[PDB]
Design a binder for this molecule. Structure first.
Ligand SMILES: Nc1ncnc2c1ncn2[C@@H]1O[C@H](COP(=O)(O)OP(=O)(O)OP(=O)(O)O)[C@@H](O)[C@H]1O
Ligand SMILES: Nc1ncnc2c1ncn2[C@@H]1O[C@H](COP(=O)(O)OP(=O)(O)OP(=O)(O)O)[C@@H](O)[C@H]1O
Lengths: 732, 732
């Protein structure tokens, strides 16, 4: 059976290489698409069989039969479709010029940015979502009367993914001379020099480089534009934020969306609801208006209404792994606030992806390409939450549900569920669960709902029974009263995330699951006792709990909210690579050996400063004023968060030197008198005071962002005075 | 056998994908055509075998043998014709300039539309049927003396499905300059700008954009035409109505058709009959005249007479499913008024295609492309009936009967009937039935005849016997005295539509057919008792009866003319998705729980307005005046039809406020005095009074269509006065 496993592994590797090769091009051939789907199904079957054999080897007849039948299927596919297997390995946009809604103020903003500045060649980059309207705004600015009056020469160059520098340079030359047959033998650099002479002969010039996709194209084309100490400007529209390094183009409002839809259809509650569902994207409004123009003007045909090639331009530029990472963001429901940490852990568990660094790099790559929107950011600048735009969400859902079978949103029949690979259900979870589903190839069970669900006791073991091959089990919105004997049979589990109301103890049978990477226990009990062999899990990396978990007496990276009785030297000696640590166990009971620790959280007198780790970067104290001199000696502390009565006192005088502090966060304190000088916070950048101000922080060079919340008006006056003395101040 | 069924399903899926791929291109290779026919036959055989196995599993040796032989045939086809399987995956029109008949008034109409209007660039779109004569009319206008005198510049641009913008722009440029070698390096946008200056140098210009097929081409080409506040005009001819959003070109009359045929043949009763059969299409007249010019001028050779590539241009632009939907319209006999609801239900049952929304979208797509003609429209603007033009009817019949075998019109022998898939017989039904036909692969039995046929008792079970695989059974023109035991063996039935004269009860064995989607019972009895398990039919959606059906004590959408004794809470609790409901059961005997209901029909004192459903959009009362104040409180009612003594009274004073009403229909009433004001009908648009007028409706902004019928001349005078005070009034 082992040699059969090796042969099946070789077949699966060749099929995976074929799938990776065919993903480089989109095929419209239906036979090729069907063959690709068949090959993907066989690949999934082979993966499941190999994982089953691996689990049995770690711990057989049915496994052998499955391996034989999958090998036979592979041979049949190779023999039958050999020829198909071998065969499977410029229009500038027309934008609106007459009825442009909402861009009247953004156009003036960009124009005033173009008409003002230094005397050098400056660039005004416009970045935005696919179909946001960057070309429309660039055209409105390009044909504006003020721009035409100020700029003697205006040139519109349409760059794209595919362009020829010689063709572009000869197109630019034709705007100045008609005898372009004299350049048939000059090189592209001589063409650029000729363009430089042409542009320098006149006055100021404005150049619109539309749809720049890489900095390489920008550098190659820029050699034709002189910098002759005149206020020459370049207007650049791009999807990627890297090419702009800007002006982030706005979204249309609800009223503007309705205005655009009404103008496009008619040169109504149903119409207003249709325009509201486009989320301020003019491309969606245009597409839906083109669809509505063909239907009759009847309220019943507009209630039935309640593109794809433009998005594919940026989706086809993603790598093979980044495409699967991007499509997995469509599993989260529409408008959902995706937690970045949860998304990263899910990506690592699904096998798409230190691994955390690569996953954060993938998320930042998706954000830079404007495929993912950021809303919440951490105080230190990291991303906290994100979401997909509704058109991007629809694209991801359609692609991953139809063409890739990455996941299926849920009722499917017994024949349909046998082909599903991942399940995402957030509505009518109990109704689907009561049907007793059974999927032998389902690898993930996702349930992202913000409403808590209590799982009936009679239905407790249905998911571990019907889906025994689960690798990801994210049911943190479902309360599990108890664990059945079938949960411990999920030997393939890598990501487990459950919520509970009465689970005060983790059984030792959890340690029988040696594939666990992330163990998230969201319980409302005050204390939790983890009896499972945490240290015997060789693949465990993160352990998140919201209670005071008590660990039993290398790859581990996070130990969130453990009890201080579990802060022994023996326990900390088993986790040399720990980076984030939290304690929520009556701090008064009590980490030096953790030389890689960066995040520390204590939730409820400070010891000498030499006891705390010297490499700590972020420290947060919750429910625990002159004691801050101990935290001042921390030479590497950069973020300090005080939440929920973290530091209580009346008078605080700044004495210690926070040589590395960048963010100071104080929440729910009784501080009355605070005296400080610029010397005590040399590197301060971020200051947040919520539900709580010496004028010495205006002398700080790095102080640029200050956040204020509800408090006495004297604090608001002090903040306003500090702002008067770019600074960002917000008071609420 | 189950695994054999899965393997056959995989083979059928691959063959279906191949058939979908080859449908994208028309092949003239006879070997390829024969191979495609063979593959289609094998696909049909596999489908029948799989459905037989599914029925048997729901409820065997012969099924296994058939599956074996079909799989062997699939392997043989794959092995023998592998190379053939792998291989299977600009002329502007010349139109008549001398002898153009019938267009003398249409040309003047379009010219007066061109010569009059605003000072902006306006478009006069000419939409029409394939071969209607749009290009001929455009050429007649283009060369008209008045057009030539008024327009200094006239340009004829021939757009088509395949065009190059650079080539078109260089062709337009050549009309102004002969040195076109100076534009060899300018981009298409610079070419459009050059054309803009060329057109703006002179005066008014007329441009004829012939054969525009998509709005994208219109938008791409329009960038070359300036709008310089001169009365510049664009004449556009297209087949699709979407590109015009017009001028619907007329059809030639019978006399004009005969004139054209006589002019074309001779530079007769048989000639007049030939010209009459062209249905006013000049293309058909031209083709038949070219055919007749070769024959001798003998009355016997003209009585023997009693194109295709032009229609294929619009047929090849249809999707794969829309092609089958279009060809199915050719099943209905020539000149037949196809009921839209019946067509949609037939499309859903045949598997071509909520499903009703998609089917209505398909019908509207066919109509917009001018492939289907609309005659009868519902009072609210929906389509009621339609038909195919005789040339499209012939095209659909020929294509679906020869190249696709979609259906066969009927006598065929036992060998020929074994290959037929669908049967359409409307003439000599009894003669064909008496022959005892037997088709093992026939899936549909269509009989669309307007003359009623009584079915002999001895011939009752012949159709369920000879055609046991029936999925669609549309014999609503045939009266069935009783149901034989073979009818209940039609387990594959999805669409059953029969007419009867003495069937007063539906047997419980109908519920044994669980595949039924539409159940139409057209009986002449006053009352009907449905004993079949309607609620056990999980796939049933529509139930249309013309009698007072008595239902027995989710997918259901229509319950037409049920008895009010069947309007219980229990019955209405089983149909939460019902949208259309009718009752014809002595209304005096008696729906709130139906929160999705839109259509309500009561056929024979109103209860308080809070009892009726709040989401009702259309309500019709038949045989049931101050009580209309109850209907006025309906905030969402838009269509109100009163037919056959619906509202009887002498004096009616408008009190209630119809805030949402758009159509008011009153038929066969004794109303004498009617007083109303504009406030009581704020949104009224349509008013119909048949076989039955305050001047307060002229103040209604939305009142644009009023229909009148036979009545006293005082009503006609009132209607004429209202019209005097665009409004559409018709009095008969
Ligand atoms: N403010 C607006 N008013 C009217 N139409 C608009 C507006 N913004 C965009 N559109 C229209 O919606 C579509 C958006 O395409 P556009 O070229 O403006 O987007 P883009 O930002 O350049 O996107 P892409 O990255 O795909 O090039 C076009 O058809 C454009 O005419
Ligand atoms: N009124 C007419 N009198 C004489 N011949 C006509 C008339 N109308 C059309 N024809 C002729 O019949 C044929 C119809 O083709 P025509 O180009 O006029 O149609 P069309 O509306 O442009 O169709 P298509 O959509 O296929 O382009 C041509 O041969 C044309 O010369």
């Amino acid at each position: 059976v082992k040699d059969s496993a090796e042969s099946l592994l070789q077949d699966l590797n060749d099929f995976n290489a074929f799938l990776k090769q065919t993903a480089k091009s989109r095929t419209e051939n239906d036979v090729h698409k069907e063959l690709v789907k068949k090959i993907k199904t066989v690949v999934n079957s082979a993966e499941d069989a190999i994982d089953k054999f691996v689990i049995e080897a770690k711990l057989v007849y049915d496994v052998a039969g499955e391996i034989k039948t999958i090998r036979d299927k592979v041979k049949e596919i190779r023999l039958n479709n050999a020829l198909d297997l071998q065969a499977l390995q410029r229009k500038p946009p027309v934008v609106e010029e007459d009825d442009v809604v909402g861009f009247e103020e953004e156009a003036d903003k960009v124009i005033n940015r173009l008409l003002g500045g230094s005397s050098g060649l400056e660039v005004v980059p416009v970045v935005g979502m696919p179909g946001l309207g960057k070309t429309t705004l660039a055209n409105k600015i390009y044909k504006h009367p003020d721009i035409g009056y100020q700029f003697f020469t205006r040139i519109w160059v349409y760059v794209s993914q595919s362009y020829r520098r010689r063709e572009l340079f000869l197109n630019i030359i034709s705007k100045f001379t008609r005898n372009t047959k004299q350049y048939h033998d000059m090189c592209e650099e001589d063409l650029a020099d000729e363009i430089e002479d042409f542009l320098g002969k006149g006055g100021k010039y404005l150049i619109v480089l539309d749809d720049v996709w890489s900095p390489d194209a920008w550098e190659r084309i820029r050699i034709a534009f002189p910098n002759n100490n005149k206020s020459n400007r370049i207007l650049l529209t791009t999807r990627d934020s890297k090419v702009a390094k800007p002006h982030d183009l706005k979204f249309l409002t609800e009223d503007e969306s309705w205005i655009l839809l009404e103008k496009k259809v008619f040169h109504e509650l149903s119409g207003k609801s249709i325009a509201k569902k486009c989320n301020g994207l003019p491309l969606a409004i245009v597409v839906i208006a083109g669809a509505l123009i063909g239907k009759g003007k009847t309220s019943r045909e507009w209630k039935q209404v309640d593109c794809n090639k433009l998005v594919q331009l940026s989706y086809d530029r993603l790598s093979y792994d980044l495409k699967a990472c991007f499509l997995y963001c469509g599993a989260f429901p529409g408008g959902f606030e995706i937690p970045a940490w949860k998304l990263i852990r899910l990506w690592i568990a699904e096998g798409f992806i230190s691994l955390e660094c690569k996953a954060e790099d993938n998320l930042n790559d998706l954000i830079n390409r404007n495929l993912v929107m950021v809303m919440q950011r951490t105080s230190d600048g990291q991303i906290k939450t994100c979401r997909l735009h509704d058109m991007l969400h629809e694209f991801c859902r359609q692609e991953a549900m139809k063409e890739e079978n990455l996941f299926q949103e849920i009722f499917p029949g017994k024949r349909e569920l046998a082909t599903y690979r991942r399940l995402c259900i957030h509505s009518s979870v109990l109704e689907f669960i009561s049907t007793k589903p059974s999927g032998e190839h389902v690898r993930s069970f996702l349930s992202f709902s913000l409403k808590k669900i209590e799982m009936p006791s009679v239905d407790i073991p249905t998911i571990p029974k019907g889906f025994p091959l689960l690798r990801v089990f994210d049911v943190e919105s479902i309360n599990f009263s108890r664990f059945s004997k079938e949960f411990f049979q999920l030997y393939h589990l890598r990501y487990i995330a459950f919520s509970s109301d009465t689970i005060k103890i983790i059984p030792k049978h959890i340690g029988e699951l040696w594939n666990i990477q992330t163990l998230i226990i969201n319980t409302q009990q005050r204390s939790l006792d983890i009896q499972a062999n945490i240290w015997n899990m060789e693949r465990l990396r993160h352990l998140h709990t919201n209670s005071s978990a008590k660990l039993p007496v290398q790859s581990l990276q996070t130990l969130s909210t453990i009890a201080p009785e579990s802060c022994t030297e023996e326990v900390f000696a088993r986790t040399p690579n720990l980076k984030k640590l939290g304690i929520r166990g009556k701090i008064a009971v009590l980490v030096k050996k953790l030389e890689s620790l960066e995040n520390l959280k204590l939730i409820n007198r400070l010891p000498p400063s030499y006891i705390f780790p010297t490499k700590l970067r972020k420290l947060s104290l919750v429910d625990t004023w002159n004691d801050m001199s101990i935290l001042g000696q921390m030479e590497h502390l950069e973020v300090l968060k005080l939440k929920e009565n973290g530091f209580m006192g009346e008078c605080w005088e700044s004495v210690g030197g926070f040589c590395s502090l960048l963010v100071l966060w104080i929440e729910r304190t009784d501080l009355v008198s605070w005296k400080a000088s610029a010397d005590h916070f040399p590197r301060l950048k971020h200051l947040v005071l919520i539900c709580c101000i010496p004028i010495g922080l205006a002398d700080i060079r790095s102080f640029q962002v200050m956040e204020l919340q509800n408090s006495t008006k004297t604090a608001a006056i002090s903040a306003r005075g500090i702002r008067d003395k770019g600074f960002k101040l917000s008071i609420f």
